Amino acid sequence: MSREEVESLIQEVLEVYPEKARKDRNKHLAVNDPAVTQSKKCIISNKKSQPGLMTIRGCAYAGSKGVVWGPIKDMIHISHGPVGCGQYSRAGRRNYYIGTTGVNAFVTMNFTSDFQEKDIVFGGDKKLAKLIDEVETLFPLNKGISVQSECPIGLIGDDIESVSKVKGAELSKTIVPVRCEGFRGVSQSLGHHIANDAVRDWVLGKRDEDTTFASTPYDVAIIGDYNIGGDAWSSRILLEEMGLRCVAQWSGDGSISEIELTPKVKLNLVHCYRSMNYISRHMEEKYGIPWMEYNFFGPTKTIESLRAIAAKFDESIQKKCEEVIAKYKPEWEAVVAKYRPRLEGKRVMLYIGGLRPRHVIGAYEDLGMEVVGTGYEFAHNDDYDRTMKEMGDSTLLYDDVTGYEFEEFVKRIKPDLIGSGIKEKFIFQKMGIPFREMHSWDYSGPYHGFDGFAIFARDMDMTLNNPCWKKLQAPWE
Amino acid sequence: SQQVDKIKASYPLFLDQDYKDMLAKKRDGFEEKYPQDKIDEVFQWTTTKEYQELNFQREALTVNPAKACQPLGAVLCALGFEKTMPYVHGSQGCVAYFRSYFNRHFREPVSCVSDSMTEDAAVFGGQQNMKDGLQNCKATYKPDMIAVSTTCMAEVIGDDLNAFINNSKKEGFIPDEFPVPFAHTPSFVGSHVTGWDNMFEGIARYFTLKSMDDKVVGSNKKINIVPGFETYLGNFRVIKRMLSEMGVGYSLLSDPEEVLDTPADGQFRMYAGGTTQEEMKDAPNALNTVLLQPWHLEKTKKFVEGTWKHEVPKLNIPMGLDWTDEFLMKVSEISGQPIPASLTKERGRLVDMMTDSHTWLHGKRFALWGDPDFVMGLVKFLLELGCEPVHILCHNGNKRWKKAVDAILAASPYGKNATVYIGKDLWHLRSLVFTDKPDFMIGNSYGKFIQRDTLHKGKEFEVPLIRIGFPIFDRHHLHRSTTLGYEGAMQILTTLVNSILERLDEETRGMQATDYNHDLVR
Amino acid sequence: SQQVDKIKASYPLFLDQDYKDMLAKKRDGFEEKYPQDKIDEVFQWTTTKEYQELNFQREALTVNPAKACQPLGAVLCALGFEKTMPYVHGSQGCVAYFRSYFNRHFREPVSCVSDSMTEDAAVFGGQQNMKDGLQNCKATYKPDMIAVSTTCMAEVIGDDLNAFINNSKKEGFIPDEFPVPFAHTPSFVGSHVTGWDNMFEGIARYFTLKSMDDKVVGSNKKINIVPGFETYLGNFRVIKRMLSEMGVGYSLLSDPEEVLDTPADGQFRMYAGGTTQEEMKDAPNALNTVLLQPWHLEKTKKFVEGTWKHEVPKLNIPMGLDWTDEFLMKVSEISGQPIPASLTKERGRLVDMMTDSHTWLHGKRFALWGDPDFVMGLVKFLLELGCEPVHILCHNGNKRWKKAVDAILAASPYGKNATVYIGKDLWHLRSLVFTDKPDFMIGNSYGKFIQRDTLHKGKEFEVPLIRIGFPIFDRHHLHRSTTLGYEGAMQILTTLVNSILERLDEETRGMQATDYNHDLVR
Numbered sequence A: 001m002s003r004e005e006v007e008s009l010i011q012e013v014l015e016v017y018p019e020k021a022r023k024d025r026n027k028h029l030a031v032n033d034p035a036v037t038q039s040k041k042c043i044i045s046n047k048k049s050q051p052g053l054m055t056i057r058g059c060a061y062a063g064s065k066g067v068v069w070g071p072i073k074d075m076i077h078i079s080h081g082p083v084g085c086g087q088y089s090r091a092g093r094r095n096y097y098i099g100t101t102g103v104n105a106f107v108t109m110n111f112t113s114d115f116q117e118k119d120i121v122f123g124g125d126k127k128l129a130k131l132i133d134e135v136e137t138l139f140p141l142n143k144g145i146s147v148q149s150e151c152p153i154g155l156i157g158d159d160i161e162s163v164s165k166v167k168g169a170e171l172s173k174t175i176v177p178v179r180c181e182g183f184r185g186v187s188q189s190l191g192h193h194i195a196n197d198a199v200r201d202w203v204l205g206k207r208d209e210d211t212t213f214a215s216t217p218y219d220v221a222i223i224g225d226y227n228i229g230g231d232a233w234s235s236r237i238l239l240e241e242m243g244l245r246c247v248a249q250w251s252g253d254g255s256i257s258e259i260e261l262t263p264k265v266k267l268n269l270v271h272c273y274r275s276m277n278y279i280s281r282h283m284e285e286k287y288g289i290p291w292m293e294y295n296f297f298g299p300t301k302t303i304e305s306l307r308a309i310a311a312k313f314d315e316s317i318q319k320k321c322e323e324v325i326a327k328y329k330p331e332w333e334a335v336v337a338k339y340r341p342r343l344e345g346k347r348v349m350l351y352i353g354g355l356r357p358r359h360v361i362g363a364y365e366d367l368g369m370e371v372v373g374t375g376y377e378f379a380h381n382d383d384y385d386r387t388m389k390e391m392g393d394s395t396l397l398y399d400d401v402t403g404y405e406f407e408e409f410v411k412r413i414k415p416d417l418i419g420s421g422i423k424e425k426f427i428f429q430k431m432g433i434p435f436r437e438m439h440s441w442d443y444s445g446p447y448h449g450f451d452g453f454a455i456f457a458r459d460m461d462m463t464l465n466n467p468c469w470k471k472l473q474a475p476w477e
Numbered sequence B, C: 001s002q003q004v005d006k007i008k009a010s011y012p013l014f015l016d017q018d019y020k021d022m023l024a025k026k027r028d029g030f031e032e033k034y035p036q037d038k039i040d041e042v043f044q045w046t047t048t049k050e051y052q053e054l055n056f057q058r059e060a061l062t063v064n065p066a067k068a069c070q071p072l073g074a075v076l077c078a079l080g081f082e083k084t085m086p087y088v089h090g091s092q093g094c095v096a097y098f099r100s101y102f103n104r105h106f107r108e109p110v111s112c113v114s115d116s117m118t119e120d121a122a123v124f125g126g127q128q129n130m131k132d133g134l135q136n137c138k139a140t141y142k143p144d145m146i147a148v149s150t151t152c153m154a155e156v157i158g159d160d161l162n163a164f165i166n167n168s169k170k171e172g173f174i175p176d177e178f179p180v181p182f183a184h185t186p187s188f189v190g191s192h193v194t195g196w197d198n199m200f201e202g203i204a205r206y207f208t209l210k211s212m213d214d215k216v217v218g219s220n221k222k223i224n225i226v227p228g229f230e231t232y233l234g235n236f237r238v239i240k241r242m243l244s245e246m247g248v249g250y251s252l253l254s255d256p257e258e259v260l261d262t263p264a265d266g267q268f269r270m271y272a273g274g275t276t277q278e279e280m281k282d283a284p285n286a287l288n289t290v291l292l293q294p295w296h297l298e299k300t301k302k303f304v305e306g307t308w309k310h311e312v313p314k315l316n317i318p319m320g321l322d323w324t325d326e327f328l329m330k331v332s333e334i335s336g337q338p339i340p341a342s343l344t345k346e347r348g349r350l351v352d353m354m355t356d357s358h359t360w361l362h363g364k365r366f367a368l369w370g371d372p373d374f375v376m377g378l379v380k381f382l383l384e385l386g387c388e389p390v391h392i393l394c395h396n397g398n399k400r401w402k403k404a405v406d407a408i409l410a411a412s413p414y415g416k417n418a419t420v421y422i423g424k425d426l427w428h429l430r431s432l433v434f435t436d437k438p439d440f441m442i443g444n445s446y447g448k449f450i451q452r453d454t455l456h457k458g459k460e461f462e463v464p465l466i467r468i469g470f471p472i473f474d475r476h477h478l479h480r481s482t483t484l485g486y487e488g489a490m491q492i493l494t495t496l497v498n499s500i501l502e503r504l505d506e507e508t509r510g511m512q513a514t515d516y517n518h519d520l521v522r
């Protein structure tokens, strides 16, 4: 569509809101212009959601527990508060790991205090101490405990800092108290920030004086990759095939030892800027470790990222990077030859959280498809700044989009594919538009790396060209 | 490496040699993992009985619970009314979690909204959030009624839902005649079934407490049915079909099957079917009100008897032979309509399926968990099949329900080795199935981890999971099955016998070792 | 040794040490068994490509056939009429085998009778056997009519059924007005479906051929449905339900529905339901006749198009979306009744389930076998589900059906890797699944041996068996399922997707080895 038509569609969609809601939502919809380098002049981000408009955003408890701390496998994470949250967030995110669940790994488990009315009225400090004692009694092989605070804990002023400090000192254990109450902030981003602050204060500086770890000039840490079906492993195999040594993974398949060993690395490879930029900046300022953004979504982005990473080291690393690129070229070339004809010219609309709306555009372009509209759940203005460059002319940008807005935007655009979460999958499937879950990879994956590119292409081809989408109209209607 | 003609997903791609070598290198170099012998020792200890005593001595830690919070049930109850928008007063993360939960269980769109209450709203109150949210929801999604629930954050600070809604109506944010029923659903009290009960009671109060002057019992010659927290569309369908076959006028309140089974024909329907407002306004005029799941409909029962003057029958859930016949007989007595020949033929066919499968169903030891009414109905049905329940678990049960289940068990010789647990979680159940091993487990998708643990101990200690309950995430379209009535009994019996036969076939597939019992006819 | 608390059946009683030692002593002493390495070598050779070439070079030996003989289908067709006793002219062992087969498949009593022909009948004939059997059957079991079919013995010695029955009526053995339709069912021609066709042809001819002078097409404003050889009760139920819901008067000929699902009420009912003689006599007055399985109703089609003067439509079996749609449109066009909105909603629900499960269903390779029409419908549904059938087998199929299936496979991109086999048995299918391994097998209970062989080769070579078809002996109450129409499509889709997910869960249950993909949500 033309630029004058996207604005008309935006106005027609906004016409249904009341005055306050319309005025607020007019600031969150924009027509892309890659020339503009400041996203503040076109879109407004990181504000509170309008009440009663069916937002897709989550809470700070999600952004901390289910995002940052949860993937850590050797730790035990306590959902301090009522049951719901832990139950709703149990095993819903596919942060893959290797370990014996119930013995030394606890990712898919749900530990909760299960607050009652008497806990609200009288407190939860004694109950928390008893819970820590029972956790240590029944799960002796855990390497740490984290306390994720749910809303009531923040409201009633339960002092989990002192309980954590006392129990950790007396039991010689690392107990990290996290104030990730849902009502804090507007979305999962503040949960990311709180979890990063907890990591900085209670975990990161534990080995500040230990010098037993021998460091090589090829030490790297993957920052912000959470192994959604093995993406972290796929990236790690490429990084290790380059001659680089990965010491830490944050936090998919990550261990507390990797977090402790991170300050000894020579370079931080940040995948998700939105979630771990604060900890990357803290490490850069305190230990002098530089950090850089890398993207392993599609062959072009992967090759560019490998070359940029190899540019940070000596000639042997560059030679190994060239060897890896040459080795992996025929496979992704064959994948393109197989799947691009079936996917050429197709239009894609995306609505994901903080990073993936701009990171996956490269793969779609590698497969011959174009992105006609992308959007962020909770991303800040810097993410949109990076997003304007990657998106073409006259493409719609939306922040904190509502179900109504997304429904009519899709109705007016008629995209060939929609990539969003589980809360819009069936809405758009019943509309006759192929849908792909861009958070869990539709229980497939991994999609990062050369190995993940083939799975990505196969999944897009099977979802887009399925015979079921041509059968939604009865022959007699 | 990937071959384009045969692409591998995570399994079995990460079983390749390069990925295995990299995993081992990462582990040994940086994971600082405990030695494998220590891990095996700890697992074996966790499978023992001393660990069971330590686990059952728990007082403050809950591991893998089998329950949810009240607003989930409140939303499920609100979804059953015509053009009704479930509104949750509180934080948006709760609504997101509810929608994800119901999307995963039903594979259907689930409409729910929130006022997105923040820290300033937690300190100054949620009056402005309530006003703006009601106005915006009505303007945007245009529902005929908004049902308000609460999150724990609002309940702790004591939000006055009645005063907030009254002020919202008084300042013109909503029309004064627009129906906005509300209910208090504290998440630290009870569970999701309590939330369903609270929401239904609130809606019933809203449409019927101020207009009881012109109501007479039996005026409309109908029977009200309250289904409670139900996640099987087949139950609603079978109740309606049975009551239509008996020729009995019925008003099933809070019927959500239409909005949870919308067709895929090119358009998205936010609202479909549901109990109408006229049906609830005319509810007191019915001859009687029947509760399908009485053990979590206590407040509703109290309100109905106190206000509608309906003598609610003391009926169990229509699960199994005896209870389905009791339900049908009570309905026939209330309405005067005799039980027709079709239901008799269905009962005879079900008894003939029981007779056919009794040789394989007898003596089987079962561990089960779930909702109180559902668990007690399953236990009763297992008792009529000759099966032996061993571990009965209900995380949201109380002492009275436990006493009722104990009486049911003592009424039968197959309940001799059966113990009932209330307030326990699935870690306790794992300890139980490791110490006192049953043949099978009946529960929701959370028991697959218990099955994994039992398999890790050994093939002879494996306890297979039979998926009957809520929520089921790892299987598709199981929410379309039936649990209540004769049809549900046939479905459950077929599932159980086929699970037993599948396990037997798996155990006897070894050639020249165990295939002497790989019989063609079973 | 047996422990009273834990009494063991054959498995795992024979896995005990004493029984193991006894069996080892027997084998090493008096069996002259081949060495185990030789057995392993022979098995591995039988799993090879050269063994497949030798297996497909067969033209004189049949190993594990996938079909039965004509009198079985004749008996099944005769059981579908009101108070009709299936009479079999020949040997009693054939009747015993038929009753055992149908008792094992249906878990219900089956009534069939024989004249008990012996070598004396081979010397002379079966005239006296015919007369005595007819008289005894009429006296004892009081049938409304007797349908006569022949075994291979009666057809080899060339018995003349018409003359025998006319003589029996002439000499007072049976009343002259007693209806005794007959049909020739040679067991060396065709299969059970041919016997069903022949029996229905004989009954229709008996009731209509001589009384076509007062018949006018469309007088009764009804449509006739001939279901063919069917062993799924839900198929009859769904056809009746859809036709009644469309508002179409229908005359469903040869309904064995009620006699195969008799309720348990303390008494035995030999007869139940079935097509009435008035319906059979009034059939020529219908608007048209619809054959649900046209590929084994050729004789019936010839008769109804030549005698009844009905323009029978060229319809495929109503299996799957497209063919159910075409069947519904043809029924609507013949009857003039529009398609109801509820059927449209059911189709939309089927499409919704398809959209939900397409991700798991896509790319899966299936090897299937069974009757021609059922196999073709299954292939069509798999092609609409994004699955690739690879090994399509039909022992009782012909070249025209193979050409039609080839056209269907050419119509879809997912039929590129398919190959259709006719006149091949399950040993050929075993060779095929060893050579070109499919993900799953769809068929009757006879594929469990193939699954056992594949498991013996290795776990990663195992091809699980999905039990759809006839006969099913190792599972209970699968005969109550449905395969026709939208409801049967949903049931088949659910079975397929749940089998796939169960296999994935089985392959991901290993701790620290493959449990990274043991996802709670699928």
Ligand code: ICS
Binding pocket: A063, A067, A093, A188, A226, A228, A272, A274, A275, A352, A353, A354, A355, A356, A357, A377, A438, A439, A440
């Ligand atoms: S952490 Fe974030 S919503 Fe950066 S909360 Fe969310 S596993 Fe999304 S776009 Mo789900 S900021 Fe990760 C994300 Fe991106 S859970 Fe995953 S897919 S790259």
Ligand code: CLF
Binding pocket: A059, A060, A061, A062, A082, A083, A084, A085, A086, A088, A149, A150, A151, A180, A181, A182, A183, B069, B071, B091, B092, B093, B094, B095, B097, B150, B151, B152, B153, B187
């Ligand atoms: S915004 Fe987030 S998810 Fe909401 S409560 Fe707060 S931390 Fe948790 Fe928890 S038990 Fe249920 S789901 Fe809530 S109502 Fe409370």
Ligand SMILES: [Fe+3]
Binding pocket: A426, B106, B107, B108, B109, C352, C353, C356
């Ligand atoms: Fe759906």
Ligand SMILES: [Fe+3]
Binding pocket: B352, B353, B356, C106, C107, C108
């Ligand atoms: Fe039976």
